[PDB]
């Protein structure tokens, strides 16, 4: 609240300093931001404690950055951490005390939890609460009565209005409890699903699962994990532990296919007990319990097919023990978020790898599903070898003179097709691919602009893939890339970042970018994170290039596009010039060649 002569807020008169400050490696700002030391001998103990109560926002190598909020604190109580259980240790760990504002905030957040509990039974949602006083003063707003369908006091609530009420209670200072007591539940018989000994659970995976299962009752929340970290395995394990009906929801045809393979590979459950509620193909969804479906079909808004209609009615009627939603970052979408209310589930676990977006709808994920249970440390995984180390880089490609003139001259937005297609980046990518091609490194180019992607591919006569590409040709190209030594590069369009199972690649060039989308960058980055059989963290075998054009709008997006990655700890190095580019022969080595491309670019319209 107090501002120094500079921008920083003043806290000299706010909180004191512990005499043994050096022993205590923890800081506590009044705003809730916390700065831990990654060099302290007791760093690990602090890391576990802070992660339990706070959600990371920046975890560079030396000094991590944690901020706590109401959602973060509620999760701590769910795992059994009381206000004194956390504040006492926080004061002990704090090297500068705890400001009263945080103290009262912690007290208010912890006490305002568990008073209101939401339980669904017999397809009816009852807002149970041991304390009756909470309900008495909770019915002041008229929305509650109209929302409601027309000790331990409970009342049934309308199915459709659950989401509206859930967000209302969050700002009402009375969060709802979504814990599932699968251990004590006889209404829905347990499913015959078991985890085979073959599956191996990594220490972070166990910790993420442990945080989800704070007590005998499973907690509904979001577990963010890298795609190469094996987030699919964790989802399977959670379903196996619940031992009740689970409805995994994908986002595309590829997503549903992989999940079924993951279930069979890691779960002993029989093949016949798994169904694919997919329009393209089905396996008698009503017949068995464990099902894999997609947001589009379940949330499909237009006319429903007769066969789908029966399945949809069957899904609505039944009650699901678990509702795994992979790629939760798309949930707050209008159609996608409707699926939450359409189906009934006790705890709706959420998995993903890039929990970031521009529109401030990510915060809704806290109430749409639950608090962010776990968010693995990408840097720590790199040290442990679970994830391939990446030498993130940003190759600056100076714009050719003529190209800039039209780019600056025109105030229209043809520039997206212009600065994405310039000779220097073309030579840069052409040179960059050539260097990696002779190094036996697998390349995965990317480009939002299909027009640029096709032009780059034909000139480099490489197997470019994109949306309307035939499925058969899509598989044929991938198989050659994985197997054929003669080919070690595939030019994938945006479809690559959506969902796929691609072979591990040593490098990932990105000539163009869709825009300032932290999702796409992290989505595309996860492709090379696939750990190799016998690599090492320090070898930096995996690389990532995000080619950009200097003095162009592309730079603004690139800096705005790397915010999420740097927060994890990745350092994006800049490369003004590439050694050996001049000696190596490359296309567009003469003014005429650039002129024809510019004319074609201008003729694009």
């Amino acid at each position: 609240t107090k501002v120094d002569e500079y921008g920083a807020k003043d806290y000299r008169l706010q909180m004191p300093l512990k005499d043994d400050h050096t022993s205590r490696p923890l800081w506590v700002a009044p705003d809730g931001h916390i700065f831990l030391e990654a060099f302290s001998p007791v760093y690990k103990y602090a890391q576990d404690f802070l992660v339990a109560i706070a959600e990371p926002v920046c975890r560079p190598t030396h000094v991590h950055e944690y901020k706590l909020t109401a959602y973060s604190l509620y999760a701590a109580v769910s795992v059994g951490l009381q206000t004194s259980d956390i504040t006492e240790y926080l004061r002990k760990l704090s090297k500068t005390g705890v400001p009263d504002g945080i103290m009262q905030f912690i007290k208010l957040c912890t006490v305002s939890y568990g008073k209101v509990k939401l339980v669904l039974k017999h397809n009816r949602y009852f807002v149970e609460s041991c304390h009756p006083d909470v309900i008495q003063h909770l019915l002041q707003d008229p929305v509650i009565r109209e929302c409601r369908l027309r000790q331990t006091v409970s009342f049934e609530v309308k199915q459709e209005m659950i989401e509206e009420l859930q967000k209302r209670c969050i700002h009402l200072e009375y969060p709802l409890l979504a814990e599932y007591d699968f251990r004590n539940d006889s209404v829905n018989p347990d499913i015959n699903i078991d985890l085979k000994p073959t599956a191996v659970l990594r220490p972070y995976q166990e910790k993420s699962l442990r945080k989800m299962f704070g007590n005998g009752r499973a907690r509904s929340g979001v577990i963010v994990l890298p795609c190469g970290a094996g987030k699919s395995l964790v989802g399977v394990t959670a379903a196996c532990t619940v031992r009740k009906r689970c409805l995994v929801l994908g986002n595309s045809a590829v997503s549903v296919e992989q999940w079924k393979a993951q279930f069979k590979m890691w779960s002993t459950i029989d093949d016949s007990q798994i169904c694919r509620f997919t329009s393209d193909a089905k396996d008698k969804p009503i017949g068995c319990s464990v099902a894999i479906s997609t947001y589009s079909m379940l949330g499909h808004t237009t006319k429903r097919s007769w066969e789908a209609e029966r399945v949809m009615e069957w899904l609505k009627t039944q009650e699901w023990g678990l509702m795994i939603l992979d790629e939760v970052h798309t949930i707050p979408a209008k159609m996608f978020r409707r699926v939450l209310t359409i189906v009934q589930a006790h705890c709706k676990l959420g998995l993903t790898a890039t929990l970031v977006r521009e529109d401030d709808k990510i915060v809704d994920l806290n109430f749409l599903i639950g608090p962010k249970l776990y968010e693995a440390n990408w840097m720590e995984l790199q040290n442990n070898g679970y994830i391939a180390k990446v030498q993130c880089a940003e190759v600056w490609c100076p714009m050719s003179p003529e190209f800039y003139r039209e780019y600056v001259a025109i105030k229209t937005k043809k520039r997206i097709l212009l600065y994405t297609m310039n000779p220097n980046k073309f030579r840069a990518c052409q040179f960059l691919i050539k260097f990696h091609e002779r190094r036996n490194d697998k390349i995965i180019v990317f480009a939002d602009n299909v027009f640029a992607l096709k032009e780059y591919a034909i000139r480099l006569n490489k197997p470019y893939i994109y949306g309307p590409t035939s499925q058969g040709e899509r598989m044929q190209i991938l198989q050659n890339f994985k197997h054929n030594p003669k080919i070690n590069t595939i030019f994938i369009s945006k479809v690559g970042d959506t969902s796929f199972d691609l072979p591990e690649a040593n490098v990932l060039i990105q000539i163009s970018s869709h825009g300032g989308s932290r999702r796409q960058e992290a989505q595309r980055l996860g492709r090379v994170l696939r750990a190799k059989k016998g690599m090492v963290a320090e070898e930096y075998n995996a690389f990532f290039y995000s080619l950009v054009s200097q003095d162009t709008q592309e730079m603004a997006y690139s800096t705005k596009r790397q915010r999420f990655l740097v927060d994890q700890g990745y350092s994006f190095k800049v490369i003004t010039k590439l050694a050996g580019m001049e000696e190596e022969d490359l296309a567009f080595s003469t003014k005429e060649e650039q002129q024809q491309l510019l004319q074609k670019v201008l003729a694009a319209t």
């Binding site: 880089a393 070898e539 010039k577 050694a579």
Partner: peptide
């Protein structure tokens, strides 16, 4: 063998 490229090993900025 399998050594890192020059433009990644050291800064390529003119400084």
């Amino acid at each position: 063998a399998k050594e890192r490229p020059i433009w990644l090993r050291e800064s390529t900025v003119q400084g």
